[PDB]
Amino acid sequence: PEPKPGDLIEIFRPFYRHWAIYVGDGYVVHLAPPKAIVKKELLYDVAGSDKYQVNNKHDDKYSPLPCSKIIQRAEELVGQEVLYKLTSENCEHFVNELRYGV
């Protein structure tokens, strides 16, 4: 089933979860090493063969930003580097910041 634009994507990679944000038409916005940059890539490629799901876990208590703001922000961040560690705590924080705001 296809994710909605703005949906948080939890990719069950072996021994670690990788987070992304769906920005429509098959694409996700996520942090990746090409030292790590914000990339706009195909969900097909980012998920690979790994199991994944939509997980807007904080939607029950927190209110998501309008889907226009989620996409404008996520896409206007693409290209910008992050000099911090690619921890699942940080990958979750990065996407939660895009969906819910600061």
Side-chain angles (χ1 to χ4, degrees), residues 40-58:
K40 179 178 153 158
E41 291 176 299
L42 285 156
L43 170 47
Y44 181 73
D45 305 330
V46 177
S49 309
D50 305 317
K51 285 170 181 159
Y52 70 90
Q53 65 174 9
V54 168
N55 194 348
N56 310 321
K57 49 175 129 189
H58 301 107

PDB file of all heavy atoms in Angstrom, residues 40-58:
ATOM      1  N   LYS A  40      17.031  13.376  -1.560  1.00  0.00           N
ATOM      2  CA  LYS A  40      15.673  13.094  -2.025  1.00  0.00           C
ATOM      3  C   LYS A  40      15.784  11.924  -2.974  1.00  0.00           C
ATOM      4  O   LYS A  40      16.327  12.043  -4.073  1.00  0.00           O
ATOM      5  CB  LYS A  40      14.966  14.307  -2.641  1.00  0.00           C
ATOM      6  CG  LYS A  40      13.572  13.990  -3.133  1.00  0.00           C
ATOM      7  CD  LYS A  40      12.898  15.227  -3.688  1.00  0.00           C
ATOM      8  CE  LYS A  40      11.872  14.835  -4.715  1.00  0.00           C
ATOM      9  NZ  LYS A  40      10.838  15.873  -4.923  1.00  0.00           N
ATOM     10  N   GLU A  41      15.356  10.751  -2.496  1.00  0.00           N
ATOM     11  CA  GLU A  41      15.509   9.528  -3.262  1.00  0.00           C
ATOM     12  C   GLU A  41      14.223   8.743  -3.320  1.00  0.00           C
ATOM     13  O   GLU A  41      13.235   9.081  -2.647  1.00  0.00           O
ATOM     14  CB  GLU A  41      16.641   8.691  -2.667  1.00  0.00           C
ATOM     15  CG  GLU A  41      18.002   9.325  -2.890  1.00  0.00           C
ATOM     16  CD  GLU A  41      19.185   8.624  -2.262  1.00  0.00           C
ATOM     17  OE1 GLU A  41      19.208   8.492  -1.017  1.00  0.00           O
ATOM     18  OE2 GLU A  41      20.105   8.233  -3.018  1.00  0.00           O
ATOM     19  N   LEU A  42      14.225   7.707  -4.188  1.00  0.00           N
ATOM     20  CA  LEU A  42      13.066   6.850  -4.372  1.00  0.00           C
ATOM     21  C   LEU A  42      12.945   5.930  -3.208  1.00  0.00           C
ATOM     22  O   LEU A  42      13.967   5.445  -2.698  1.00  0.00           O
ATOM     23  CB  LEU A  42      13.131   6.068  -5.679  1.00  0.00           C
ATOM     24  CG  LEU A  42      12.842   6.900  -6.916  1.00  0.00           C
ATOM     25  CD1 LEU A  42      13.459   6.284  -8.151  1.00  0.00           C
ATOM     26  CD2 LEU A  42      11.363   7.169  -7.070  1.00  0.00           C
ATOM     27  N   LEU A  43      11.690   5.757  -2.730  1.00  0.00           N
ATOM     28  CA  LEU A  43      11.391   4.892  -1.613  1.00  0.00           C
ATOM     29  C   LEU A  43      11.862   3.512  -1.992  1.00  0.00           C
ATOM     30  O   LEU A  43      12.516   2.845  -1.187  1.00  0.00           O
ATOM     31  CB  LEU A  43       9.895   4.927  -1.259  1.00  0.00           C
ATOM     32  CG  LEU A  43       9.373   3.882  -0.231  1.00  0.00           C
ATOM     33  CD1 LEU A  43      10.241   3.785   0.989  1.00  0.00           C
ATOM     34  CD2 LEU A  43       7.997   4.207   0.212  1.00  0.00           C
ATOM     35  N   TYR A  44      11.619   3.132  -3.261  1.00  0.00           N
ATOM     36  CA  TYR A  44      12.015   1.850  -3.830  1.00  0.00           C
ATOM     37  C   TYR A  44      13.490   1.570  -3.559  1.00  0.00           C
ATOM     38  O   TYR A  44      13.821   0.490  -3.069  1.00  0.00           O
ATOM     39  CB  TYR A  44      11.726   1.831  -5.327  1.00  0.00           C
ATOM     40  CG  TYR A  44      12.081   0.524  -5.994  1.00  0.00           C
ATOM     41  CD1 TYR A  44      11.300  -0.615  -5.798  1.00  0.00           C
ATOM     42  CD2 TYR A  44      13.175   0.430  -6.849  1.00  0.00           C
ATOM     43  CE1 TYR A  44      11.615  -1.824  -6.416  1.00  0.00           C
ATOM     44  CE2 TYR A  44      13.501  -0.773  -7.473  1.00  0.00           C
ATOM     45  CZ  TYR A  44      12.711  -1.896  -7.263  1.00  0.00           C
ATOM     46  OH  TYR A  44      13.007  -3.089  -7.882  1.00  0.00           O
ATOM     47  N   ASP A  45      14.356   2.562  -3.795  1.00  0.00           N
ATOM     48  CA  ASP A  45      15.789   2.402  -3.587  1.00  0.00           C
ATOM     49  C   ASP A  45      16.200   2.435  -2.104  1.00  0.00           C
ATOM     50  O   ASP A  45      17.026   1.603  -1.719  1.00  0.00           O
ATOM     51  CB  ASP A  45      16.580   3.456  -4.379  1.00  0.00           C
ATOM     52  CG  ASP A  45      16.285   3.492  -5.868  1.00  0.00           C
ATOM     53  OD1 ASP A  45      15.935   2.415  -6.442  1.00  0.00           O
ATOM     54  OD2 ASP A  45      16.361   4.601  -6.460  1.00  0.00           O
ATOM     55  N   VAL A  46      15.661   3.401  -1.291  1.00  0.00           N
ATOM     56  CA  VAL A  46      15.961   3.586   0.137  1.00  0.00           C
ATOM     57  C   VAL A  46      15.532   2.358   0.947  1.00  0.00           C
ATOM     58  O   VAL A  46      16.300   1.904   1.785  1.00  0.00           O
ATOM     59  CB  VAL A  46      15.329   4.879   0.697  1.00  0.00           C
ATOM     60  CG1 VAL A  46      15.590   5.030   2.194  1.00  0.00           C
ATOM     61  CG2 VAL A  46      15.842   6.094  -0.055  1.00  0.00           C
ATOM     62  N   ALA A  47      14.328   1.816   0.705  1.00  0.00           N
ATOM     63  CA  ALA A  47      13.868   0.616   1.425  1.00  0.00           C
ATOM     64  C   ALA A  47      14.643  -0.617   0.999  1.00  0.00           C
ATOM     65  O   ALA A  47      14.966  -1.464   1.828  1.00  0.00           O
ATOM     66  CB  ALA A  47      12.395   0.380   1.194  1.00  0.00           C
ATOM     67  N   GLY A  48      14.941  -0.704  -0.288  1.00  0.00           N
ATOM     68  CA  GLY A  48      15.611  -1.866  -0.841  1.00  0.00           C
ATOM     69  C   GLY A  48      14.723  -3.092  -0.715  1.00  0.00           C
ATOM     70  O   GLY A  48      13.517  -3.044  -1.011  1.00  0.00           O
ATOM     71  N   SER A  49      15.305  -4.169  -0.215  1.00  0.00           N
ATOM     72  CA  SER A  49      14.579  -5.413  -0.018  1.00  0.00           C
ATOM     73  C   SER A  49      14.000  -5.451   1.405  1.00  0.00           C
ATOM     74  O   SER A  49      13.155  -6.300   1.705  1.00  0.00           O
ATOM     75  CB  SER A  49      15.506  -6.603  -0.258  1.00  0.00           C
ATOM     76  OG  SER A  49      16.182  -6.491  -1.501  1.00  0.00           O
ATOM     77  N   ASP A  50      14.451  -4.518   2.271  1.00  0.00           N
ATOM     78  CA  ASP A  50      14.060  -4.443   3.672  1.00  0.00           C
ATOM     79  C   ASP A  50      12.580  -4.134   3.858  1.00  0.00           C
ATOM     80  O   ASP A  50      11.966  -3.450   3.039  1.00  0.00           O
ATOM     81  CB  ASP A  50      14.913  -3.414   4.430  1.00  0.00           C
ATOM     82  CG  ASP A  50      16.398  -3.672   4.313  1.00  0.00           C
ATOM     83  OD1 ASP A  50      16.809  -4.850   4.416  1.00  0.00           O
ATOM     84  OD2 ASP A  50      17.148  -2.705   4.098  1.00  0.00           O
ATOM     85  N   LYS A  51      12.015  -4.680   4.946  1.00  0.00           N
ATOM     86  CA  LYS A  51      10.650  -4.444   5.369  1.00  0.00           C
ATOM     87  C   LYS A  51      10.555  -3.013   5.869  1.00  0.00           C
ATOM     88  O   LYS A  51      11.538  -2.459   6.353  1.00  0.00           O
ATOM     89  CB  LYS A  51      10.248  -5.447   6.441  1.00  0.00           C
ATOM     90  CG  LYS A  51       9.974  -6.847   5.876  1.00  0.00           C
ATOM     91  CD  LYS A  51       9.806  -7.907   6.968  1.00  0.00           C
ATOM     92  CE  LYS A  51       9.562  -9.277   6.385  1.00  0.00           C
ATOM     93  NZ  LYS A  51       9.884 -10.354   7.370  1.00  0.00           N
ATOM     94  N   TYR A  52       9.425  -2.374   5.644  1.00  0.00           N
ATOM     95  CA  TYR A  52       9.224  -1.005   6.107  1.00  0.00           C
ATOM     96  C   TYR A  52       7.745  -0.752   6.349  1.00  0.00           C
ATOM     97  O   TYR A  52       6.893  -1.506   5.880  1.00  0.00           O
ATOM     98  CB  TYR A  52       9.794   0.010   5.106  1.00  0.00           C
ATOM     99  CG  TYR A  52       9.023   0.099   3.806  1.00  0.00           C
ATOM    100  CD1 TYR A  52       7.960   0.988   3.664  1.00  0.00           C
ATOM    101  CD2 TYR A  52       9.378  -0.678   2.705  1.00  0.00           C
ATOM    102  CE1 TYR A  52       7.246   1.076   2.469  1.00  0.00           C
ATOM    103  CE2 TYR A  52       8.707  -0.556   1.486  1.00  0.00           C
ATOM    104  CZ  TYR A  52       7.638   0.321   1.375  1.00  0.00           C
ATOM    105  OH  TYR A  52       6.959   0.453   0.184  1.00  0.00           O
ATOM    106  N   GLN A  53       7.440   0.337   7.044  1.00  0.00           N
ATOM    107  CA  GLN A  53       6.070   0.731   7.303  1.00  0.00           C
ATOM    108  C   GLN A  53       5.920   2.220   7.582  1.00  0.00           C
ATOM    109  O   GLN A  53       6.873   2.904   7.994  1.00  0.00           O
ATOM    110  CB  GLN A  53       5.543  -0.040   8.491  1.00  0.00           C
ATOM    111  CG  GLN A  53       6.270   0.301   9.767  1.00  0.00           C
ATOM    112  CD  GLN A  53       5.651  -0.351  10.950  1.00  0.00           C
ATOM    113  OE1 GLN A  53       4.766  -1.214  10.836  1.00  0.00           O
ATOM    114  NE2 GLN A  53       6.126   0.049  12.104  1.00  0.00           N
ATOM    115  N   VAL A  54       4.690   2.693   7.468  1.00  0.00           N
ATOM    116  CA  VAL A  54       4.402   4.066   7.850  1.00  0.00           C
ATOM    117  C   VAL A  54       4.295   4.082   9.380  1.00  0.00           C
ATOM    118  O   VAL A  54       3.713   3.158   9.945  1.00  0.00           O
ATOM    119  CB  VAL A  54       3.129   4.604   7.137  1.00  0.00           C
ATOM    120  CG1 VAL A  54       2.647   5.922   7.754  1.00  0.00           C
ATOM    121  CG2 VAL A  54       3.372   4.735   5.624  1.00  0.00           C
ATOM    122  N   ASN A  55       4.889   5.077  10.055  1.00  0.00           N
ATOM    123  CA  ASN A  55       4.774   5.135  11.506  1.00  0.00           C
ATOM    124  C   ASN A  55       4.732   6.571  12.021  1.00  0.00           C
ATOM    125  O   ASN A  55       5.741   7.099  12.473  1.00  0.00           O
ATOM    126  CB  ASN A  55       5.900   4.374  12.159  1.00  0.00           C
ATOM    127  CG  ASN A  55       5.652   4.105  13.620  1.00  0.00           C
ATOM    128  OD1 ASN A  55       4.727   4.658  14.252  1.00  0.00           O
ATOM    129  ND2 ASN A  55       6.473   3.229  14.186  1.00  0.00           N
ATOM    130  N   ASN A  56       3.557   7.170  12.045  1.00  0.00           N
ATOM    131  CA  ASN A  56       3.444   8.525  12.560  1.00  0.00           C
ATOM    132  C   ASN A  56       3.097   8.412  14.051  1.00  0.00           C
ATOM    133  O   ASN A  56       2.108   8.959  14.507  1.00  0.00           O
ATOM    134  CB  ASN A  56       2.407   9.317  11.731  1.00  0.00           C
ATOM    135  CG  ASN A  56       2.613   9.247  10.223  1.00  0.00           C
ATOM    136  OD1 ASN A  56       3.711   9.283   9.732  1.00  0.00           O
ATOM    137  ND2 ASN A  56       1.563   9.190   9.439  1.00  0.00           N
ATOM    138  N   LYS A  57       3.922   7.666  14.806  1.00  0.00           N
ATOM    139  CA  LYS A  57       3.697   7.315  16.229  1.00  0.00           C
ATOM    140  C   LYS A  57       3.247   8.487  17.111  1.00  0.00           C
ATOM    141  O   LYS A  57       2.293   8.325  17.878  1.00  0.00           O
ATOM    142  CB  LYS A  57       4.917   6.617  16.878  1.00  0.00           C
ATOM    143  CG  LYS A  57       6.301   7.257  16.704  1.00  0.00           C
ATOM    144  CD  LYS A  57       7.346   6.467  17.534  1.00  0.00           C
ATOM    145  CE  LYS A  57       8.556   6.083  16.711  1.00  0.00           C
ATOM    146  NZ  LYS A  57       9.494   5.147  17.412  1.00  0.00           N
ATOM    147  N   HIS A  58       3.868   9.666  16.952  1.00  0.00           N
ATOM    148  CA  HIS A  58       3.566  10.834  17.777  1.00  0.00           C
ATOM    149  C   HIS A  58       2.319  11.609  17.330  1.00  0.00           C
ATOM    150  O   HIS A  58       2.031  12.630  17.920  1.00  0.00           O
ATOM    151  CB  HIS A  58       4.798  11.749  17.849  1.00  0.00           C
ATOM    152  CG  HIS A  58       5.960  11.014  18.436  1.00  0.00           C
ATOM    153  ND1 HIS A  58       7.027  10.608  17.652  1.00  0.00           N
ATOM    154  CD2 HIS A  58       6.112  10.499  19.679  1.00  0.00           C
ATOM    155  CE1 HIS A  58       7.828   9.922  18.458  1.00  0.00           C
ATOM    156  NE2 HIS A  58       7.312   9.821  19.684  1.00  0.00           N
TER     157      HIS A  58
END
